[PDB]
Design a protein around this ligand. Structure first.
Ligand SMILES: CCCCCCCCO[C@@H]1O[C@H](CO)[C@@H](O)[C@H](O)[C@H]1O
Ligand SMILES: CCCCCCCCO[C@@H]1O[C@H](CO)[C@@H](O)[C@H](O)[C@H]1O
Ligand SMILES: CCCCCCCCO[C@@H]1O[C@H](CO)[C@@H](O)[C@H](O)[C@H]1O
Ligand SMILES: CCCCCCCCO[C@@H]1O[C@H](CO)[C@@H](O)[C@H](O)[C@H]1O
Length: 494
């Protein structure tokens, strides 16, 4: 009937693996560094317990419920929880958001593969002061991406970058066309321990760094210790970070859970996978980028450096640091290959909702479903590769506002429209362990308030222009119109 996860471990590794690629290998330190160290940890762990842990369980319960019904996509599951025609249109978001993200994320996943190859081969620029070293790497990334000089709205991507984009798309297709058990699960069971050893090695190797300008021990000292706690800005930063910590709102959790059998546990399994992301992110992610950045530029600059961006830190600053340390070019290969494997576990997960839609609703073969999903993602990506602000616009609508708005939609449908006490049964059913019943009050009231707070602060910021962003808006609007036509074509089949 429906493909199911062969192993309980592989299910956890695959579920843990999708949030691994969502930046947090380098993303947590930047968001920390902006908020400082032990400042960030208190709202962030609190947000992890208050928002991520409940909302994750909400996503698991919705997906498995749909799997028994035979649907792993949001438009159908929303209709099962809420028998209303507006629910299917809202469901298109949970199909729209991962698709738009996939369009721009797989291309970023190519950059790690292309760099790793160039670092492996040694085709890397090699040069006291920060500006002397960072410029040859800024140009190296910019030549690769094809970023134009200054303002110009057209990118000239490298042929090498384009050839790698074909290879990158192909590798996903290879993993996806095999299915859940022989594709994602086999790869997750391979990729996740590969990431552990790579991170642990890098963490140990980063730990030994020391320069006349600073010491990597001070970078760790930075990460662990008001009045930032009193400043409302930090609570905003941590909650949005939890979404990427656990891949909430992207709809990836809902789809993977649909392949869980009707009576298998989600409580212990989801908590475990949620814990794996935390340990990887707090320990392995925190002890690489910032401690290395602090060791070379001093404690003060890395904070200012991290404010510039994660790409500057991840794709320019960190590779420049490795070039100066002893061996050296090899570390750059590891760091980017580490990012590439993490991207694979996520890119295969972020394209799964679209694939499951074609199989479940349009009754396409998985071979056809994967290839038509790959074609949509590959074709649309040309918009991201050649338009200057296109990547940023999609990431703002799908990756930022959308994931928060969609998570808030999940709670209201599953815990309010569906019936909270009805839903509490679905979370804990077949659970090896079962949720503490304090969360019933948190899932019902405390968690939705926080998601509501997050949306209004951004609306306060963004309720009040380059032309190229309108093309990107116009395009993703059509995608939503297109996916609505597919929900319409599928609802008229029966
Ligand atoms: C393989 C992919 C590498 C992971 C890099 C993604 C880390 C995300 O990076 C962050 O994305 C935010 C957008 O919401 C930006 O506002 C931030 O400047 C940036 O730090
Ligand atoms: C097989 C997928 C469609 C192929 C047609 C895409 C045409 C764009 O391919 C272009 O080739 C140029 C060669 O120098 C590169 O400079 C460009 O960056 C690249 O986008
Ligand atoms: C990169 C940070 C995430 C690392 C995920 C590593 C997942 C651990 O890996 C798993 O651990 C189990 C024991 O706990 C073993 O039984 C499994 O063989 C192994 O796959
Ligand atoms: C642009 C994406 C289109 C997908 C490529 C489909 C190629 C033709 O698909 C065909 O469908 C048949 C029915 O299962 C199979 O028996 C054939 O092996 C296959 O070649």
């Amino acid at each position: 009937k429906r493909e199911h996860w062969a192993t309980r471990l592989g299910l956890i590794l695959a579920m843990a693996g999708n949030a691994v690629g969502l930046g947090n290998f380098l993303r947590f330190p930047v968001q920390a560094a902006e908020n400082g160290g032990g400042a960030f940890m208190i709202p962030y762990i609190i947000a992890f317990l208050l928002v991520g842990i409940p909302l994750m369980w909400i996503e698991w319960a919705m997906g498995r419920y749909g799997g028994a019904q035979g649907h792993g996509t949001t438009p159908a599951i929303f209709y099962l929880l809420w028998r209303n025609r507006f629910a299917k249109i809202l469901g298109v978001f949970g199909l729209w958001i991962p698709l738009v993200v996939a369009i721009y994320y797989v291309y970023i996943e190519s950059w790690t593969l292309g760099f790793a190859i160039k670092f492996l081969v040694g085709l890397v620029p090699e040069p006291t002061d920060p500006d002397s070293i960072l410029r040859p790497f800024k140009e190296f990334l910019y030549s690769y991406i094809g970023v134009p000089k200054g303002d110009e709205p057209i990118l000239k991507p490298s042929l090498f970058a384009y050839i790698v984009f074909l290879i990158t798309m192909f590798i996903n297709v290879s993993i996806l066309i095999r299915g859940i058990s022989k594709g994602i699960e086999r790869f997750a069971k391979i990729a996740m321990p590969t990431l552990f050893i790579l991170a642990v090695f890098l963490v140990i190797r980063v730990f030994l760094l020391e320069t006349p300008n600073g010491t990597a021990a001070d970078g760790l000292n930075f990460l662990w210790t008001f009045e930032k706690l009193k400043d409302p800005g930090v609570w905003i930063a941590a909650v949005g970070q939890i979404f990427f910590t656990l891949s909430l709102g992207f709809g990836a959790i809902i789809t993977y859970a649909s392949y869980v059998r009707k009576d298998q546990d989600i409580v212990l399994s989801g908590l475990t996978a949620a814990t794996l992301n935390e340990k990887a992110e707090v320990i392995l992610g925190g002890s690489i980028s910032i401690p290395a950045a602090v060791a070379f530029f001093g404690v003060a600059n890395a904070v200012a450096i991290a404010k510039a961006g994660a790409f500057n830190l991840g794709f320019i600053t960190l590779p420049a640091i490795f070039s100066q340390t002893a061996g050296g070019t090899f570390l750059g290969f590891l760091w980017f290959f580490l990012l590439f494997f993490a991207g694979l576990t996520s890119s295969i997960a972020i394209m799964q909702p679209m694939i499951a839609f074609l199989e479940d609703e349009l009754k396409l073969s998985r071979k056809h479903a994967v290839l038509w999903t790959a074609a949509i993602v590959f074709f649309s990506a040309h918009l991201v590769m050649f338009l200057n602000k296109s990547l940023d616009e999609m990431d703002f609508w799908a990756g930022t506002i959308g994931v928060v708005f969609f998570g808030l939609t999940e709670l209201i449908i599953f815990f309010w429209i569906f019936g909270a006490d009805k839903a509490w049964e679905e979370i804990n059913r077949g659970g090896i362990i079962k949720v503490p019943r304090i969360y019933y009050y948190v899932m019902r009231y405390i968690t939705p308030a926080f998601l509501a707070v997050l949306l209004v602060v951004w609306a306060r910021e963004y309720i009040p222009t380059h032309w190229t962003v309108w093309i990107t808006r116009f395009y993703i609007i059509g995608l939503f119109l297109f996916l609505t036509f597919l929900v319409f074509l599928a609802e008229r089949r029966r």
